Amino acid sequence: DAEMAAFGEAAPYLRKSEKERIEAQNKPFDAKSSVFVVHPKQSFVKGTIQSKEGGKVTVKTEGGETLTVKEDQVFSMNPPKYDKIEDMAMMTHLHEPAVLYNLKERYAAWMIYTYSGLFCVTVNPYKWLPVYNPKVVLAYRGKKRQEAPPHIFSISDNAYQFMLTDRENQSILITGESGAGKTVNTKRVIQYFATIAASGEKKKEEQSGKMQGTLEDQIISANPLLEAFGNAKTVRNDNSSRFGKFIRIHFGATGKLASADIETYLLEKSRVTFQLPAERSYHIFYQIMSNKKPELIDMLLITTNPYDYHYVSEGEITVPSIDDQEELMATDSAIDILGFSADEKTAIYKLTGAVMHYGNLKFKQKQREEQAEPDGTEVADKAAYLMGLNSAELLKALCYPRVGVGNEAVTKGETVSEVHNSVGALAKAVYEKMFLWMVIRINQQLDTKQPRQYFIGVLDIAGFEIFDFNSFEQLCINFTNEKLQQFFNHHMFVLEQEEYKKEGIEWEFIDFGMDLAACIELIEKPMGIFSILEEECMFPKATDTSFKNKLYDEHLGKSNNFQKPKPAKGKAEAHFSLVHYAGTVDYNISGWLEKNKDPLNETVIGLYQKSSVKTLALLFATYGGEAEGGGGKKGGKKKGSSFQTVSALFRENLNKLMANLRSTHPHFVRCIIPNETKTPGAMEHELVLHQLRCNGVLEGIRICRKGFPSRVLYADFKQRYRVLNASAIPEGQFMDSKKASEKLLGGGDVDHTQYAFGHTKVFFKAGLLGLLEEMRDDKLAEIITATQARCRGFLMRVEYRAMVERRESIFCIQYNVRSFMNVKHWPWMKLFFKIKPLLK
């Protein structure tokens, strides 16, 4: 309360009033009866234990329901002291339910940031909050996470701190499902950096501030370009990230901004050509056809009605929450700031329209032949011109692909179906490349000469998602995540072990990563999936089926993580399941071989390679330089620098990454999505539960509980408990951030067993907190019983003062009555009586 001011307005969403707290922690609780329990419809609901069937349990509900469930379908419930705990990992009850429940409660209260160990859980508000508030930004500035409530800037600042304090590079790993809202965070983190450590001095003035011509802006401006090209309306989000990314913010020596570095991973090439019914393609398209810059429409030779471009109107065209017109400029302007040449800025556009046109390219069967022949030179003409090509040459290459089988170049004829498909392949190919280029070009501007001493990497990618249908793309992502996870499990193992070393506890344990090495080797190692995948790609006459068998003959029965599918449930077909940390994933191998080969009509590429549109020409260069290497039929593309695998890079890139991640001090952020239905203050259970498993959150709790569940960070320990032996615990905490907590525990009639210290934190049992209380319980009997007595004593002590006072007033009353009883019958007195009145 006193503290909170900085936020003030945000406060309510960060922390609760000091009595709201108090009114919550200090309330009646019946441990032995209060519990969490399994539940057929709702995941886990709370209840009170009624009876006990010797190994069955009957419980009441909170809604009113009675169920008799197993002994282990029943889970304890944390004392009220742990209501809306900033760090669930401090709880003395490391369960599945308690975690779900904590998140949930502090959300219904509008607190989106709750920590779960090292993580920084984040829940989609689905509404607006004063959190990103320009006041907060400062507030979180220079504060350990124990000096402030759960928030992302905490993570983000600490990184910075740590950056300069330890002289190590840092990282932030943001991860969640499609609708979790990571971009948003990522972006928000980024602003944070830019703000708190900028100072271009000259660039700071209110004169076209943030326009092209400064980075802090470039840095920023970056996003809105990428977003136009790599973002789209998903059925979950309205601006979903259809690719992954890694930015390196290169801080200087002083500590002020110096450089940036983007890298893109796994772009959703398919959107370019397809789209689900409730979705839509990349924005750009819709941006452009919006008509805010009419020249563009005529320049590209298109219309404003998307239904003229099959490729981009298979799903939806308009989204209410998006103003395509505004963005177009945003985009536009960003390009400029980004330093692109008008020409390039022209290529981009012109090139983005060609692609639309391609999808309009039509063909027909030559008569009496099964060959494809152009169905007109209306569109080709446009595509051709827009790309700096020749209509004819183009349609030929497309129709009569001139190949090179043997030591020559053999002209091959294609079918209608073959063309339509090849076209689509280029459309996608071109878009991609371009996108890649843009990134590079961005990076290029984001390159300064100033020295760099450290960087802070911000990684944004998807998390392990399980679908009834898992294809190639899923493997690639899952694999990424299963790696990332191990990356953590280790950091934690390293980390943990420091405490027990700092404190002096005697705990031995094996790396937690190790548990996952099994799965990883199976994928990335030599006779593993990828290899078998990338070898077969060399066999001119291999089949998905072929590949499949090779997969089995070699891994089946011999490998544990390897399994043959469970074809039924919500799944669509059979091929192979894997046993990832998050669970079993059923993978379908169909298209892999192809997808992995990235087959492109080289004749056409030829044309690109010699376009009048330099940029287009450029994008293709690297294909043109490896052809030397795969001159004759069969063989190896790599000889000339051409990719041999769809997967060959992914790995290379994923390695270059995980390596960059190592020379880093990992900082974790887990983004969460409350309800599919888009409702603030709500949460489907099992939906959040899922995420938690695949997040790493539930695995961090596990590793924590091995053991000594709740683990308190030292400052977080000082503040909250100094008050217990106030003098001696405060001194300890202040005198040595760690040594303090040590010193503190000096007092209390508590089990000096139940805990254990170490380099970054204390370890504590539960049934520990349970132990604590008990001691406490006895200590009040003392306190009370004694306080009762005095009272009791004192109580009667006042009775004597009254008894005594009364002493005479009674007598007076006593005797006085007696008189009368005697008198009232006496003549003389009756006389006086009748007579007493006549007097005066």
CSV table of N, CA, C and O in Angstrom, one decimal, residues 397-460:
chain,number,residue,atom,x,y,z
A,397,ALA,N,8.7,-22.9,-70.0
A,397,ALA,CA,9.4,-23.4,-68.8
A,397,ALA,C,8.5,-24.1,-67.9
A,397,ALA,O,8.7,-25.2,-67.4
A,398,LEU,N,7.4,-23.5,-67.7
A,398,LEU,CA,6.3,-24.0,-66.8
A,398,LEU,C,5.7,-25.3,-67.4
A,398,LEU,O,5.5,-26.2,-66.6
A,399,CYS,N,5.4,-25.3,-68.7
A,399,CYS,CA,4.7,-26.4,-69.4
A,399,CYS,C,5.7,-27.5,-69.9
A,399,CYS,O,5.4,-28.6,-69.8
A,400,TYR,N,6.8,-27.1,-70.4
A,400,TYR,CA,7.8,-27.9,-70.9
A,400,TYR,C,9.1,-27.8,-70.1
A,400,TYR,O,10.2,-27.4,-70.7
A,401,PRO,N,9.1,-28.1,-68.9
A,401,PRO,CA,10.2,-28.0,-68.0
A,401,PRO,C,11.3,-28.7,-68.6
A,401,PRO,O,11.3,-29.9,-68.9
A,402,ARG,N,12.4,-28.0,-68.8
A,402,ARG,CA,13.6,-28.6,-69.4
A,402,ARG,C,14.7,-28.9,-68.3
A,402,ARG,O,15.4,-28.0,-67.7
A,403,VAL,N,14.7,-30.2,-68.0
A,403,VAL,CA,15.4,-30.9,-67.0
A,403,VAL,C,16.8,-31.3,-67.5
A,403,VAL,O,17.2,-30.9,-68.7
A,404,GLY,N,17.6,-31.9,-66.7
A,404,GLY,CA,19.0,-32.4,-66.9
A,404,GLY,C,19.4,-33.7,-66.3
A,404,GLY,O,20.3,-33.7,-65.5
A,405,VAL,N,18.7,-34.8,-66.8
A,405,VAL,CA,18.9,-36.2,-66.4
A,405,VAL,C,20.1,-36.9,-67.2
A,405,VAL,O,20.0,-37.2,-68.4
A,406,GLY,N,21.1,-37.3,-66.5
A,406,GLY,CA,22.3,-37.9,-67.1
A,406,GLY,C,23.3,-36.8,-67.0
A,406,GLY,O,23.7,-36.3,-65.9
A,407,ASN,N,23.9,-36.4,-68.2
A,407,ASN,CA,24.9,-35.4,-68.2
A,407,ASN,C,24.5,-34.2,-69.1
A,407,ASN,O,25.2,-33.2,-69.3
A,408,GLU,N,23.2,-34.3,-69.5
A,408,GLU,CA,22.6,-33.3,-70.4
A,408,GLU,C,21.4,-32.7,-69.7
A,408,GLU,O,21.2,-32.7,-68.5
A,409,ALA,N,20.6,-32.1,-70.6
A,409,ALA,CA,19.4,-31.4,-70.3
A,409,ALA,C,18.2,-31.9,-71.2
A,409,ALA,O,18.0,-31.4,-72.3
A,410,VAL,N,17.4,-32.7,-70.6
A,410,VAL,CA,16.3,-33.4,-71.2
A,410,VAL,C,14.9,-32.7,-71.0
A,410,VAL,O,14.4,-32.6,-69.9
A,411,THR,N,14.3,-32.2,-72.1
A,411,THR,CA,13.1,-31.5,-72.0
A,411,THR,C,11.9,-32.5,-71.6
A,411,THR,O,11.6,-33.3,-72.4
A,412,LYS,N,11.3,-32.2,-70.5
A,412,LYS,CA,10.2,-32.9,-69.9
A,412,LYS,C,8.8,-32.2,-70.0
A,412,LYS,O,8.7,-31.0,-69.7
A,413,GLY,N,7.8,-33.0,-70.3
A,413,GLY,CA,6.5,-32.5,-70.4
A,413,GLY,C,5.6,-32.7,-69.1
A,413,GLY,O,5.7,-33.8,-68.5
A,414,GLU,N,4.8,-31.8,-68.8
A,414,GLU,CA,4.0,-31.9,-67.6
A,414,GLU,C,2.5,-31.9,-67.8
A,414,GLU,O,2.1,-31.5,-68.9
A,415,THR,N,1.8,-32.4,-66.8
A,415,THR,CA,0.4,-32.4,-66.9
A,415,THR,C,-0.3,-31.2,-66.3
A,415,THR,O,0.4,-30.4,-65.7
A,416,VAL,N,-1.6,-31.1,-66.5
A,416,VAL,CA,-2.3,-29.9,-66.0
A,416,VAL,C,-2.1,-29.9,-64.5
A,416,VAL,O,-1.6,-29.0,-63.9
A,417,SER,N,-2.4,-31.0,-63.9
A,417,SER,CA,-2.2,-31.1,-62.4
A,417,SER,C,-0.8,-30.8,-62.0
A,417,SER,O,-0.6,-30.4,-60.9
A,418,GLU,N,0.1,-31.1,-62.8
A,418,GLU,CA,1.5,-30.9,-62.4
A,418,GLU,C,1.9,-29.4,-62.5
A,418,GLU,O,2.8,-29.0,-61.6
A,419,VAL,N,1.3,-28.7,-63.3
A,419,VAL,CA,1.6,-27.3,-63.5
A,419,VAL,C,1.1,-26.5,-62.4
A,419,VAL,O,1.8,-25.9,-61.7
A,420,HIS,N,-0.2,-26.7,-62.2
A,420,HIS,CA,-1.0,-26.0,-61.1
A,420,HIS,C,-0.2,-26.1,-59.8
A,420,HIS,O,0.0,-25.2,-59.1
A,421,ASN,N,0.3,-27.3,-59.6
A,421,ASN,CA,1.1,-27.6,-58.4
A,421,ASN,C,2.4,-26.9,-58.5
A,421,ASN,O,2.9,-26.3,-57.5
A,422,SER,N,3.1,-26.9,-59.6
A,422,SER,CA,4.4,-26.3,-59.6
A,422,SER,C,4.4,-24.8,-59.4
A,422,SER,O,5.2,-24.1,-58.8
A,423,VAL,N,3.4,-24.2,-60.0
A,423,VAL,CA,3.1,-22.8,-59.9
A,423,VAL,C,3.1,-22.4,-58.4
A,423,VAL,O,3.8,-21.6,-57.9
A,424,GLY,N,2.2,-23.1,-57.8
A,424,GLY,CA,2.0,-23.0,-56.4
A,424,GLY,C,3.3,-23.1,-55.6
A,424,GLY,O,3.6,-22.4,-54.7
A,425,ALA,N,4.1,-24.0,-56.1
A,425,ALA,CA,5.4,-24.1,-55.5
A,425,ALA,C,6.3,-23.0,-55.6
A,425,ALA,O,7.0,-22.6,-54.6
A,426,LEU,N,6.2,-22.3,-56.8
A,426,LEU,CA,7.1,-21.1,-56.9
A,426,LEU,C,6.5,-20.0,-56.1
A,426,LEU,O,7.3,-19.3,-55.3
A,427,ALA,N,5.2,-19.8,-56.2
A,427,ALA,CA,4.5,-18.7,-55.5
A,427,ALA,C,4.9,-18.7,-54.0
A,427,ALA,O,5.4,-17.8,-53.5
A,428,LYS,N,4.9,-19.9,-53.4
A,428,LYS,CA,5.3,-20.1,-52.1
A,428,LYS,C,6.8,-19.8,-52.0
A,428,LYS,O,7.3,-19.2,-51.0
A,429,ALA,N,7.6,-20.5,-52.8
A,429,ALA,CA,9.0,-20.3,-52.8
A,429,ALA,C,9.4,-18.9,-52.8
A,429,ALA,O,10.2,-18.4,-52.0
A,430,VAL,N,8.9,-18.1,-53.8
A,430,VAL,CA,9.2,-16.7,-53.9
A,430,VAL,C,8.9,-15.9,-52.7
A,430,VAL,O,9.7,-15.0,-52.3
A,431,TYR,N,7.7,-16.1,-52.2
A,431,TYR,CA,7.2,-15.3,-51.1
A,431,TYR,C,8.2,-15.5,-49.9
A,431,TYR,O,8.6,-14.5,-49.3
A,432,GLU,N,8.4,-16.8,-49.6
A,432,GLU,CA,9.3,-17.1,-48.5
A,432,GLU,C,10.6,-16.4,-48.6
A,432,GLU,O,10.8,-15.5,-47.8
A,433,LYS,N,11.4,-16.8,-49.6
A,433,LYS,CA,12.7,-16.1,-49.9
A,433,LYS,C,12.7,-14.7,-49.6
A,433,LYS,O,13.5,-14.1,-48.9
A,434,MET,N,11.7,-14.0,-50.2
A,434,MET,CA,11.5,-12.6,-50.1
A,434,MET,C,11.5,-12.2,-48.7
A,434,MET,O,12.2,-11.3,-48.2
A,435,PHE,N,10.6,-12.9,-48.0
A,435,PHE,CA,10.5,-12.7,-46.6
A,435,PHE,C,11.8,-12.8,-45.9
A,435,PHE,O,12.1,-12.1,-45.0
A,436,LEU,N,12.5,-13.8,-46.3
A,436,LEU,CA,13.9,-14.0,-45.7
A,436,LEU,C,14.7,-12.8,-46.0
A,436,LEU,O,15.4,-12.2,-45.1
A,437,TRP,N,14.7,-12.4,-47.2
A,437,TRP,CA,15.5,-11.3,-47.7
A,437,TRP,C,15.2,-10.0,-46.8
A,437,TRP,O,16.1,-9.4,-46.4
A,438,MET,N,13.9,-9.7,-46.7
A,438,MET,CA,13.5,-8.5,-46.0
A,438,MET,C,14.1,-8.5,-44.7
A,438,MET,O,14.7,-7.5,-44.2
A,439,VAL,N,14.1,-9.7,-44.0
A,439,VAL,CA,14.7,-9.8,-42.7
A,439,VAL,C,16.1,-9.5,-42.8
A,439,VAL,O,16.6,-8.6,-42.0
A,440,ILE,N,16.9,-10.1,-43.7
A,440,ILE,CA,18.3,-9.7,-43.9
A,440,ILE,C,18.5,-8.3,-44.1
A,440,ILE,O,19.3,-7.6,-43.5
A,441,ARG,N,17.8,-7.7,-45.0
A,441,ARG,CA,17.9,-6.3,-45.2
A,441,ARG,C,17.7,-5.5,-44.0
A,441,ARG,O,18.4,-4.5,-43.6
A,442,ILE,N,16.7,-6.0,-43.2
A,442,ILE,CA,16.4,-5.3,-41.9
A,442,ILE,C,17.7,-5.3,-41.1
A,442,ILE,O,18.3,-4.3,-40.8
A,443,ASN,N,18.1,-6.5,-40.8
A,443,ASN,CA,19.3,-6.8,-40.1
A,443,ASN,C,20.5,-5.9,-40.5
A,443,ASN,O,21.3,-5.4,-39.7
A,444,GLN,N,20.5,-5.7,-41.8
A,444,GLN,CA,21.6,-4.9,-42.4
A,444,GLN,C,21.6,-3.4,-41.9
A,444,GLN,O,22.6,-2.8,-41.7
A,445,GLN,N,20.4,-2.9,-41.8
A,445,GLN,CA,20.3,-1.6,-41.3
A,445,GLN,C,20.6,-1.6,-39.8
A,445,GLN,O,21.2,-0.7,-39.3
A,446,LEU,N,20.1,-2.6,-39.2
A,446,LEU,CA,20.3,-2.8,-37.7
A,446,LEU,C,21.7,-3.1,-37.3
A,446,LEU,O,21.9,-3.5,-36.2
A,447,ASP,N,22.6,-2.9,-38.3
A,447,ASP,CA,24.0,-3.1,-38.1
A,447,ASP,C,24.7,-1.8,-37.9
A,447,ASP,O,24.8,-1.0,-38.8
A,448,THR,N,25.4,-1.7,-36.7
A,448,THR,CA,26.1,-0.5,-36.5
A,448,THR,C,27.5,-0.8,-36.3
A,448,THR,O,27.8,-2.0,-36.2
A,449,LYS,N,28.3,0.2,-36.3
A,449,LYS,CA,29.8,0.0,-36.1
A,449,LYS,C,30.1,0.0,-34.7
A,449,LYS,O,31.1,-0.7,-34.3
A,450,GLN,N,29.4,0.8,-33.8
A,450,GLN,CA,29.6,0.8,-32.4
A,450,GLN,C,29.9,-0.6,-31.8
A,450,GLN,O,29.3,-1.5,-32.2
A,451,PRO,N,30.8,-0.6,-30.8
A,451,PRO,CA,31.1,-1.8,-30.1
A,451,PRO,C,30.0,-2.4,-29.4
A,451,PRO,O,29.1,-1.7,-29.0
A,452,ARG,N,30.0,-3.7,-29.2
A,452,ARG,CA,29.0,-4.6,-28.6
A,452,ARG,C,29.7,-5.4,-27.5
A,452,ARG,O,30.8,-6.0,-27.8
A,453,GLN,N,29.2,-5.5,-26.3
A,453,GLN,CA,29.8,-6.3,-25.3
A,453,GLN,C,29.0,-7.5,-24.9
A,453,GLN,O,29.5,-8.5,-24.5
A,454,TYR,N,27.7,-7.3,-24.9
A,454,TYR,CA,26.7,-8.3,-24.6
A,454,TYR,C,25.4,-8.0,-25.3
A,454,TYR,O,25.1,-7.0,-25.8
A,455,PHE,N,24.5,-9.1,-25.3
A,455,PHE,CA,23.3,-9.0,-26.0
A,455,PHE,C,22.2,-9.7,-25.1
A,455,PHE,O,22.5,-10.4,-24.2
A,456,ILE,N,21.0,-9.4,-25.5
A,456,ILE,CA,19.9,-10.0,-24.8
A,456,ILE,C,19.0,-10.6,-25.8
A,456,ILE,O,18.4,-9.9,-26.6
A,457,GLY,N,18.9,-11.9,-25.8
A,457,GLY,CA,18.1,-12.6,-26.8
A,457,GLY,C,16.7,-12.8,-26.4
A,457,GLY,O,16.4,-13.3,-25.3
A,458,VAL,N,15.8,-12.5,-27.3
A,458,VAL,CA,14.4,-12.6,-27.1
A,458,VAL,C,13.9,-13.6,-28.1
A,458,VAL,O,13.9,-13.4,-29.3
A,459,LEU,N,13.6,-14.8,-27.7
A,459,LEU,CA,13.1,-15.8,-28.5
A,459,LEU,C,11.6,-16.0,-28.4
A,459,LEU,O,11.0,-16.2,-27.3
A,460,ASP,N,11.0,-16.0,-29.6
A,460,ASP,CA,9.6,-16.2,-29.7
A,460,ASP,C,9.3,-17.3,-30.8
A,460,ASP,O,9.7,-17.1,-31.9
